[PDB]
Design a protein around this motif. Structure first.
Motif, mmCIF file in Angstrom:
data_model
loop_
_atom_site.group_PDB
_atom_site.id
_atom_site.type_symbol
_atom_site.label_atom_id
_atom_site.label_comp_id
_atom_site.label_asym_id
_atom_site.label_seq_id
_atom_site.Cartn_x
_atom_site.Cartn_y
_atom_site.Cartn_z
ATOM 1 N N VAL A 25 0.839 -1.190 0.000
ATOM 2 C CA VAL A 25 0.000 0.000 0.000
ATOM 3 C C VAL A 25 0.878 1.245 0.000
ATOM 4 C CG1 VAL A 25 -2.096 0.989 0.966
ATOM 5 C CG2 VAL A 25 -1.490 -1.392 1.464
ATOM 6 N N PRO A 26 0.671 2.123 -0.983
ATOM 7 C CA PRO A 26 1.525 3.314 -1.104
ATOM 8 C C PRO A 26 1.371 4.289 0.052
ATOM 9 C CG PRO A 26 0.364 2.843 -3.160
ATOM 10 C CD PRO A 26 -0.274 2.006 -2.103
ATOM 11 N N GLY A 27 2.433 4.458 0.836
ATOM 12 C CA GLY A 27 2.459 5.459 1.883
ATOM 13 C C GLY A 27 1.746 5.096 3.164
ATOM 14 N N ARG A 28 1.342 3.843 3.339
ATOM 15 C CA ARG A 28 0.656 3.401 4.551
ATOM 16 C C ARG A 28 1.563 2.397 5.255
ATOM 17 N NH1 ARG A 28 -4.383 5.997 3.506
ATOM 18 N NH2 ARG A 28 -3.601 7.423 1.895
ATOM 19 N N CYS A 29 2.482 2.917 6.073
ATOM 20 C CA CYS A 29 3.506 2.110 6.738
ATOM 21 C C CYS A 29 4.242 1.234 5.729
ATOM 22 C CB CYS A 29 2.901 1.267 7.863
ATOM 23 S SG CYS A 29 2.222 2.231 9.230
ATOM 24 N N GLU A 30 4.487 1.793 4.548
ATOM 25 C CA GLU A 30 5.041 1.034 3.433
ATOM 26 C C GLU A 30 6.482 0.653 3.733
ATOM 27 O OE1 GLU A 30 4.813 3.072 -0.259
ATOM 28 O OE2 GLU A 30 6.088 1.641 -1.330
ATOM 29 N N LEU A 31 6.725 -0.640 3.919
ATOM 30 C CA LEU A 31 8.076 -1.118 4.168
ATOM 31 C C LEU A 31 8.898 -1.044 2.887
ATOM 32 C CD1 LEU A 31 9.999 -2.545 6.253
ATOM 33 C CD2 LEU A 31 9.206 -4.693 5.250
ATOM 34 N N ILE A 32 10.081 -0.445 2.980
ATOM 35 C CA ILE A 32 11.023 -0.381 1.871
ATOM 36 C C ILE A 32 12.073 -1.454 2.120
ATOM 37 C CG2 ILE A 32 12.559 1.076 0.523
ATOM 38 C CD1 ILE A 32 9.634 1.926 0.498
ATOM 39 N N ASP A 33 12.034 -2.520 1.326
ATOM 40 C CA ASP A 33 12.874 -3.690 1.544
ATOM 41 C C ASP A 33 13.925 -3.765 0.447
ATOM 42 O OD1 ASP A 33 13.964 -6.199 2.227
ATOM 43 O OD2 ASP A 33 12.018 -6.909 2.948
ATOM 44 N N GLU A 34 15.195 -3.817 0.852
ATOM 45 C CA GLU A 34 16.313 -3.966 -0.069
ATOM 46 C C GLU A 34 17.343 -4.945 0.481
ATOM 47 O OE1 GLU A 34 17.223 -2.926 -3.089
ATOM 48 O OE2 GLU A 34 15.343 -1.888 -3.531
ATOM 49 N N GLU A 35 16.887 -5.945 1.237
ATOM 50 C CA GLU A 35 17.754 -6.947 1.859
ATOM 51 C C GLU A 35 18.772 -6.289 2.792
ATOM 52 O OE1 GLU A 35 16.322 -7.544 -1.029
ATOM 53 O OE2 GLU A 35 15.342 -9.344 -0.241
ATOM 54 N N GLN A 36 18.247 -5.609 3.810
ATOM 55 C CA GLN A 36 19.071 -4.975 4.827
ATOM 56 C C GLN A 36 18.545 -5.350 6.206
ATOM 57 O OE1 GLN A 36 16.788 -2.937 3.175
ATOM 58 N NE2 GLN A 36 15.537 -2.576 5.001
ATOM 59 N N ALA A 37 19.366 -5.092 7.221
ATOM 60 C CA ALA A 37 19.111 -5.566 8.574
ATOM 61 C C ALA A 37 18.204 -4.649 9.385
ATOM 62 C CB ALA A 37 20.437 -5.755 9.319
ATOM 63 N N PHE A 38 17.738 -3.539 8.817
ATOM 64 C CA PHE A 38 16.841 -2.635 9.519
ATOM 65 C C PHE A 38 15.640 -2.312 8.643
ATOM 66 C CE2 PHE A 38 18.141 1.083 7.092
ATOM 67 C CZ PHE A 38 19.434 0.771 6.728
ATOM 68 N N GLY A 39 14.495 -2.111 9.290
ATOM 69 C CA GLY A 39 13.282 -1.793 8.561
ATOM 70 C C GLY A 39 13.200 -0.312 8.228
ATOM 71 N N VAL A 40 12.687 -0.026 7.034
ATOM 72 C CA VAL A 40 12.456 1.337 6.573
ATOM 73 C C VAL A 40 11.003 1.432 6.134
ATOM 74 C CG1 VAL A 40 13.043 3.107 4.893
ATOM 75 C CG2 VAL A 40 14.842 1.680 5.875
ATOM 76 N N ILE A 41 10.239 2.307 6.781
ATOM 77 C CA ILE A 41 8.823 2.482 6.485
ATOM 78 C C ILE A 41 8.567 3.939 6.137
ATOM 79 C CG2 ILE A 41 8.004 0.528 7.844
ATOM 80 C CD1 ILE A 41 7.452 2.370 10.124
ATOM 81 N N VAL A 42 7.748 4.156 5.114
ATOM 82 C CA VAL A 42 7.341 5.488 4.684
ATOM 83 C C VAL A 42 5.849 5.619 4.951
ATOM 84 C CG1 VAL A 42 7.156 7.092 2.767
ATOM 85 C CG2 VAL A 42 9.157 5.608 2.957
ATOM 86 N N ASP A 43 5.467 6.649 5.700
ATOM 87 C CA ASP A 43 4.079 6.856 6.078
ATOM 88 C C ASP A 43 3.673 8.295 5.796
ATOM 89 O OD1 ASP A 43 1.773 5.353 7.425
ATOM 90 O OD2 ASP A 43 1.817 7.203 8.605
ATOM 91 N N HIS A 44 2.364 8.502 5.677
ATOM 92 C CA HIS A 44 1.786 9.799 5.360
ATOM 93 C C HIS A 44 1.408 10.601 6.600
ATOM 94 C CE1 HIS A 44 -1.786 7.703 6.481
ATOM 95 N NE2 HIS A 44 -2.601 8.669 6.098
ATOM 96 N N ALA A 45 1.782 10.133 7.790
ATOM 97 C CA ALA A 45 1.407 10.814 9.023
ATOM 98 C C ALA A 45 2.010 12.212 9.068
ATOM 99 C CB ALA A 45 1.863 9.999 10.231
ATOM 100 N N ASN A 46 1.141 13.224 9.139
ATOM 101 C CA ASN A 46 1.564 14.618 9.184
ATOM 102 C C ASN A 46 0.838 15.397 10.275
ATOM 103 O OD1 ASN A 46 -0.761 14.190 7.587
ATOM 104 N ND2 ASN A 46 -0.553 16.224 6.664
ATOM 105 N N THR A 47 0.320 14.714 11.286
ATOM 106 C CA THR A 47 -0.423 15.319 12.377
ATOM 107 C C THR A 47 0.120 14.804 13.699
ATOM 108 O OG1 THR A 47 -2.117 13.593 12.161
ATOM 109 C CG2 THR A 47 -2.533 15.696 11.059
ATOM 110 N N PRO A 48 -0.028 15.579 14.778
ATOM 111 C CA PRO A 48 0.489 15.120 16.079
ATOM 112 C C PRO A 48 -0.082 13.788 16.533
ATOM 113 C CG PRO A 48 0.015 17.455 16.151
ATOM 114 C CD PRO A 48 -0.523 16.965 14.842
ATOM 115 N N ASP A 49 -1.374 13.545 16.306
ATOM 116 C CA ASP A 49 -1.963 12.280 16.731
ATOM 117 C C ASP A 49 -1.682 11.159 15.741
ATOM 118 O OD1 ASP A 49 -2.875 13.949 18.679
ATOM 119 O OD2 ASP A 49 -4.987 13.372 18.515
ATOM 120 N N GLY A 50 -1.526 11.485 14.458
ATOM 121 C CA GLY A 50 -1.100 10.481 13.500
ATOM 122 C C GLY A 50 0.312 9.997 13.764
#
Lengths: 220, 98, 268, 338, 55
Positions: A25-50
Motif C-alpha cells: 500500500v503506497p504510503g501506509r507504513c510502506e516497508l522499503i525492503d532492499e535486503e538490509q538488517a533494519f526496517g524502513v517504512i514510509v508513512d503519510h502521518a503529518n499530524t500530532p496524533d497520526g
C-alpha cells in the motif's frame, strides 16, 4: 482508519493495526525492503496524533532504535510545529527534522518553530554545529536537523543499524516537494530505495555515519 | 604640525580610543580632564611626510603620496572629506576657502 | 559676525554589485575592439555604441563584465597588511592558496546546517568527497548543498565574508586582547592584530559598506574615450571569462582571477 | 557638522557670542543622535572644552542626561555612571533621560547596560532615583530573554539557563503566546546582514555589552584594585585627588622635579591648570567611590541584592517572571505557584 | 609652484580661471574602474537638505 489498506487487501504489512485490516500500500507504513538488517517504512502521518499512533505501532515491533524523519508544511498548520517535535523526541531514539513542503516560507523558519517545542532555537543548534558536537536531549534521545529533505532522508537511512527502524513520515505516497510555487517531483520511496543501495560503498570508504556530523577518514 | 600629535599607548584600551591611535594633542588634553577611561598617550614627533599622510582630507593624502594605499583604506570605511583645505578644492576645481 | 556657512562633503566607498549594474544600464560580452572590414565598433564589444554611445557620452558611460566566478579585489588581499586576512583572522599564506593554489576550504559558512566534520584548509582533496558522497546523494542533489561543507576559490572567501558576525569579532578580539595583557615580539604583534581587527569590524557596522564587496562579482569597465594597455587587459579578462562559462575549471578560475589582478594592480 | 560649524563661530568669536550651557547642550545632542559614524570622541572633546570653561559655564539637567545617553549608547558605562550620579541631584532627573521613550529610550538602555555588566549596586541606586521622580520602569528595560528572565534575575550565574520550577515547562504555551499561530513569532534564525538578532541590542551603537554576572564583576573589580596597588608599590591610592598631585608636582633639566620647577618658571604649566571635571563641577560625592577596597562577592550578598532589586521593580511597575522568582511571599503576590 | 604663488596672493578667482570640471569628472570614472564611487554632496545651510552633484 484502515480504509486504504483494507481496500488493497479486498481487491487482491507491519503493526497490529494491519492485523485488523487482514481480518476485514503506497504510503501506509510502506516497508522499503532492499535486503538490509533494519526496517524502513514510509508513512503519510503529518499530524500530532497520526505521528503518536504511528510511533507507538513501531515501538511494539521491538526495534533497537527508532529513527524518525519529520517535517512541517509551510504557510499552514502553524500550531502543530512545536507539538510534533515534542512527540517525535519523546518516542523516537533519534529525530531528524527536515522540510516537508516549505512553499513560500523559509525552511529554516519552520524548523525554528519546530525546535521551540523542546526549548531549542536554530541559533543554538548552529552553535553546536560549529563545535562539531550536538548534545542529546534531557531524556537521552538525539535530535539532528537539515533543511534539505533529500539529505535528511538518506542520512537517516545511513544511521540505521542491525535491528532498527527508520520512519520517514509526512509525505507518504505524495510525489512532489513544493518549493516556492513549483511542485518539483520528489518521491520519498525512491530516496529510501536509492540510499539503501549505495549505503554499502559509503561505509567501506571509511565514513562513520553513526550520527551528525559524519567522521570522514581525513577529518579529526 | 610636527609636534601636534600624541600616540595612544599600547595599554590604553577603551570605547573612546584604541591603542596605537594617532590623536591630536589638544583633543587628548581635553578628554583627560573629562574622563578616566584609560586615556594613556605619549607625545610623538611626526616628520612632515608622515604628518601629511595623517590629515583630515583623504584627497590631499591621495594626491601627495601612496595614492593606492590611501584610497583603499578610506574607501573601506566610507571616509568623508569636508573640503576645508586648499588643495582639496583645487582638485575639485572650485574656489579655495582663502 | 555669523560665518557664511558652507557644508560640502565627498566620500569614497566600496561599491556593491548592484551599484555596478546601475552604472552601466550595458554588459560587455565580446573581446572585440573594432571590425577589420567595416572599421566600425563591434557589437557588444569594448566600444559598442549601444553600451557606450554613438561615435560625448562615451567619456562618461560605464559598462561592466559579468564574471562567471567571483574574484577577490587585489587591493584588499595582497597589499600588506591584508584586510581580508585580518578580518577573517587567517594568515595570508593559508588564504592566498585558496585563491591561486589548488586548495579547498571546509565549512565556509556557519548559518546553515552541515553534517560533515571537516574544517579548515585542505591542501589536498578529500578522497571520499570525490566518489562516495556524490554517488550516495546523487549529483543533482549533491550540488545543492555542495558549497556549504567545503568550497574553493575566491567564492569561498566571499561566503566567509558574507557570513561574518561583526559583533562577535569585536567581543572575541577584546577578550583575547585582555588575556594576553594579563600574561615577547609575538604577544605585542598579536595585540596589534587584534586592535586592527576590532577597529575594522566597527567601521563596517556604522557604515553602509559590506565586507563581502571586497570580492568582486561584476567588473566595471572604463568608458571607451578614456581608453582610446588597458584595452588588452580587458580583452584578456573577457577572453578567459568567456572560456570559463563555456566549460560550465579550477585552473580556469585562476586564469580569470589572475587576469583581474593584472587589470586592477599589477606588480603585486 | 552643521551644528559644530555654528559652535565654532561662537567659541572663537567675540565675548557676546560665547557659548552658554544651552549652546553646549545643542552641540552635544547633535553628536549623540548622529545618523552614522562614531561620535564618542567628538562628544568627549566637547565635554573637555566645557570643563575648561567652568568659570563661565556650568551644567544643567540636560547636560548630564545627554552625556548619560551618549556614553550608554557607546557602552562607556563607567562614564555614564559618573554623570548619572550628577543627574540624580537635579529635580525631574530620570524623566529627562527617559525622553518620553524616544531615541531608543535612553533610560532603559542605561538600566540594561548595568544589568548586562553585573553592576547591580549601581542598578539599584538607579531605581531609587526613578522612584523619587515618580518614573515607572519602561518595558524596554524589562525586556525578556529566551529563558524567560529579566533584569531581576539575569546576573545570578547559572547564565542563560532556566530554573527548576518544580514542573516541566510548557513550550507549546510559550509558542502560542509568542505569536506562533499567526506568523508574528520572533524566529531566532541567524541571517546575513549587519542587523543584530538579539532584540536587547537595539539602541546601542555596537550592540549591547557582553553578559557579565555579578560574581564576575566583583572578581574583576577585586583584581583591578590590587593591580593599582602593585603599580604604586613599584613606584594608599590617590586617584582623583588633585590636591595631592598638586603637592607632588611642587634645555629643560633631566631631573623630573627640577623640570617641573622650570615649567612653572617659564609658564609652561602651573597648578592653576591642574583641575578635573569633579572639582570644577562640584562633584564632592566622587571621592567616596574611589580609592576604596572593593567588597568580595558572597552568595548571601547576591541574594539580599536580588530581594531588594525585586522589591524595587515591583513597586515601580515591573513584573518579574516566574523563572526569575525561581532563580532568586513575593512570588505568590505576583500570582505564581511553584 | 604657480598654484602655490596664486594661493599665497589669495587670488582665488584667478586660480579658478587658470584651472578651468573635466579633470575631476574623468577622475571619478577611473576610480569607478576600481569599484570605488566618489560622490560629491552639498548640504544646504538653510534647510539641511543634501544634494548630490552631477559628477
Amino acid at each position: 482508519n484502515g480504509k486504504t489498506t483494507t481496500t488493497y487487501l479486498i481487491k487482491s504489512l507491519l503493526g497490529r493495526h494491519n492485523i485488523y485490516n487482514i481480518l476485514a500500500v503506497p504510503g501506509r507504513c510502506e516497508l522499503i525492503d532492499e535486503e538490509q538488517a533494519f526496517g524502513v517504512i514510509v508513512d503519510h502521518a503529518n499530524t500530532p496524533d497520526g505521528l503518536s499512533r504511528l510511533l507507538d505501532s513501531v515501538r511494539e515491533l521491538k526495534p533497537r532504535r527508532i529513527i524518525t524523519v519529520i517535517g512541517c508544511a509551510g504557510e499552514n498548520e502553524r500550531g502543530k510545529r512545536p507539538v510534533m517535535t515534542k512527540i517525535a523526541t519523546e518516542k523516537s531514539d533519534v529525530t531528524m527534522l527536515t522540510s516537508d513542503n516549505p512553499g513560500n516560507e523559509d525552511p529554516l523558519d519552520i524548523l525554528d518553530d519546530m525546535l521551540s517545542g523542546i526549548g531549542w532555537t536554530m541559533q543554538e543548534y548552529l552553535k553546536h554545529g560549529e563545535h562539531d558536537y550536538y548534545p542529546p536531549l534531557s531524556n537521552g534521545h538525539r535530535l539532528f536537523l537539515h533543511d534539505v529533505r533529500r539529505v535528511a532522508v538518506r542520512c537517516a537511512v545511513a544511521m540505521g543499524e542491525e535491528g532498527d527502524m527508520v520512519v520517514v513520515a509526512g509525505k507518504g505516497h505524495e510525489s512532489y516537494q513544493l518549493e516556492g510555487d513549483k511542485k518539483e517531483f520528489y518521491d520519498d520511496r525512491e530516496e529510501c530505495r536509492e540510499a539503501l543501495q549505495y549505503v554499502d560503498e559509503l561505509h567501506q570508504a571509511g565514513i562513520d555515519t553513526s550520527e551528525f556530523p559524519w567522521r570522514l577518514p581525513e577529518s579529526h | 604640525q610636527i609636534t601636534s600629535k600624541v600616540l595612544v599607548s599600547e595599554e590604553g584600551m577603551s570605547n573612546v580610543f584604541l591603542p596605537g591611535e594617532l590623536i591630536g594633542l589638544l583633543r587628548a588634553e581635553r578628554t583627560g580632564r573629562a574622563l578616566e577611561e584609560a586615556i594613556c598617550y605619549r607625545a610623538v614627533l611626526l616628520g612632515i611626510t608622515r604628518a601629511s599622510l595623517n590629515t583630515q582630507s583623504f584627497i590631499s593624502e591621495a594626491s601627495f603620496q601612496e595614492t593606492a594605499r590611501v584610497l583603499a583604506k578610506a574607501a573601506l570605511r566610507g571616509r568623508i572629506d569636508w573640503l576645508k583645505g586648499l588643495k582639496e578644492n583645487v582638485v575639485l576645481g572650485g574656489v579655495i576657502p582663502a | 559676525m555669523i560665518d557664511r556657512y558652507k557644508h560640502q562633503q565627498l566620500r569614497i566607498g566600496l561599491v556593491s554589485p548592484q551599484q555596478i549594474s546601475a552604472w552601466a544600464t550595458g554588459e560587455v560580452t565580446k573581446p572585440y575592439t573594432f571590425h577589420y572590414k567595416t572599421n566600425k565598433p563591434e557589437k557588444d564589444g569594448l566600444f559598442c555604441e549601444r553600451i557606450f554611445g554613438p561615435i560625448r557620452i562615451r567619456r562618461y558611460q560605464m559598462g561592466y563584465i559579468k564574471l562567471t566566478c567571483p574574484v577577490t579585489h587585489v587591493w584588499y588581499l595582497k597589499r600588506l597588511p591584508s584586510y581580508i586576512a585580518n578580518l577573517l583572522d587567517k594568515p595570508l599564506k593559508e588564504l592566498e592558496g585558496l585563491v591561486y593554489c589548488d586548495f579547498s576550504f571546509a565549512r565556509p559558512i556557519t548559518k546553515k546546517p552541515t553534517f560533515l566534520r571537516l574544517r579548515g584548509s585542505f591542501e589536498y582533496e578529500i578522497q571520499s568527497w570525490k566518489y562516495s558522497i556524490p554517488l550516495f546523494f546523487t549529483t543533482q542533489g549533491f550540488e545543492i548543498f555542495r558549497n556549504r561543507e567545503i568550497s574553493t576559490g575566491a567564492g569561498a572567501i566571499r561566503e566567509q565574508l558574507a557570513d561574518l558576525d561583526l559583533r562577535i569579532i569585536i567581543e572575541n578580539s577584546l577578550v583575547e586582547w585582555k588575556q594576553l595583557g594579563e600574561e615577547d615580539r609575538k604577544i605585542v604583534r598579536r595585540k596589534d592584530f587584534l586592535v586592527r581587527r576590532m577597529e575594522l569590524a566597527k567601521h563596517f557596522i556604522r557604515t553602509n559598506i559590506e565586507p563581502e564587496w571586497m570580492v568582486l562579482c561584476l567588473l566595471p569597465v572604463l568608458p571607451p574615450e578614456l581608453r582610446p594597455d588597458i584595452n588588452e587587459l580587458y580583452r584578456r579578462v573577457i577572453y578567459r571569462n568567456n572560456t570559463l562559462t563555456d566549460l560550465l575549471v579550477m585552473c580556469q578560475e585562476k586564469l580569470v582571477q589572475e587576469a583581474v589582478d593584472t587589470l586592477l594592480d599589477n606588480g603585486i | 557638522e552643521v551644528a559644530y560649524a555654528t559652535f565654532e563661530n561662537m567659541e572663537y568669536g567675540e565675548d557676546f557670542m560665547k557659548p552658554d550651557t544651552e549652546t553646549y547642550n545643542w552641540v552635544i545632542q547633535a553628536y549623540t543622535r548622529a545618523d552614522s559614524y562614531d561620535r564618542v570622541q567628538d562628544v568627549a572633546e566637547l565635554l573637555g572644552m566645557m570643563v575648561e570653561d567652568y568659570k563661565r559655564v556650568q551644567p544643567n539637567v540636560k547636560t548630564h542626561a545627554l552625556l548619560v545617553e551618549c556614553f550608554t549608547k557607546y557602552c562607556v558605562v563607567k562614564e555614564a555612571i559618573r554623570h548619572f550620579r550628577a543627574l540624580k541631584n537635579f529635580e525631574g532627573g530620570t524623566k529627562v533621560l527617559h525622553n518620553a521613550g524616544n531615541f531608543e529610550d535612553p533610560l532603559s538602555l542605561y538600566l540594561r547596560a548595568l544589568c548586562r555588566e553585573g553592576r547591580i549596586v549601581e542598578l539599584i541606586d538607579a531605581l531609587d532615583a526613578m522612584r523619587r521622580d515618580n518614573q515607572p520602569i519602561p518595558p524596554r528595560a524589562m525586556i525578556m530573554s529566551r529563558k524567560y528572565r529579566t533584569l531581576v534575575s539575569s546576573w545570578i550565574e547559572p547564565l542563560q539557563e532556566e530554573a527548576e520550577l518544580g514542573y516541566e515547562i510548557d513550550y507549546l504555551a510559550r509558542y502560542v503566546e509568542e505569536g506562533g499561530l499567526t506568523g508574528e513569532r520572533k524566529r531566532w534564525v541567524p541571517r546575513r546582514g549587519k542587523t543584530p538578532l538579539d532584540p536587547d541590542a537595539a539602541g546601542f551603537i555596537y550592540s549591547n555589552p557582553i553578559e557579565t554576572s555579578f560574581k564576575q564583576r566583583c572578581l574583576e573589580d577585586w583584581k583591578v584594585h590590587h593591580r593599582k596597588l602593585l603599580r604604586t608599590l613599584q613606584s594608599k591610592l590617590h586617584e582623583g585627588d588633585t590636591e595631592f598631585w598638586k603637592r607632588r608636582f611642587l634645555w629643560f633639566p633631566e631631573e623630573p622635579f627640577e623640570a617641573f620647577k622650570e615649567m612653572r618658571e617659564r609658564k609652561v604649566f602651573d597648578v592653576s591648570d591642574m583641575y578635573t571635571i569633579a572639582d570644577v563641577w562640584g562633584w564632592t560625592w566622587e571621592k567616596d567611590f574611589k580609592n576604596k577596597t572593593p567588597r568580595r562577592w558572597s552568595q548571601e550578598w547576591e541574594v539580599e541584592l536580588a530581594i531588594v532589586l525585586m522589591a524595587k521593580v515591583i513597586e515601580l511597575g515591573g513584573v518579574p517572571t516566574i523563572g526569575d522568582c525561581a532563580v532568586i511571599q513575593t512570588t505568590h503576590s505576583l500570582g505564581y505557584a511553584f | 609652484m604657480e598654484v602655490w604663488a596664486l594661493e599665497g596672493f589669495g587670488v582665488a578667482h584667478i586660480l579658478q580661471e587658470m584651472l578651468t570640471p573635466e579633470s575631476f569628472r574623468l577622475l571619478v570614472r577611473e576610480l569607478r574602474s576600481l569599484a570605488l564611487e566618489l560622490n560629491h554632496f552639498l548640504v544646504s545651510e538653510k534647510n539641511f537638505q543634501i544634494n548630490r552633484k552631477e559628477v
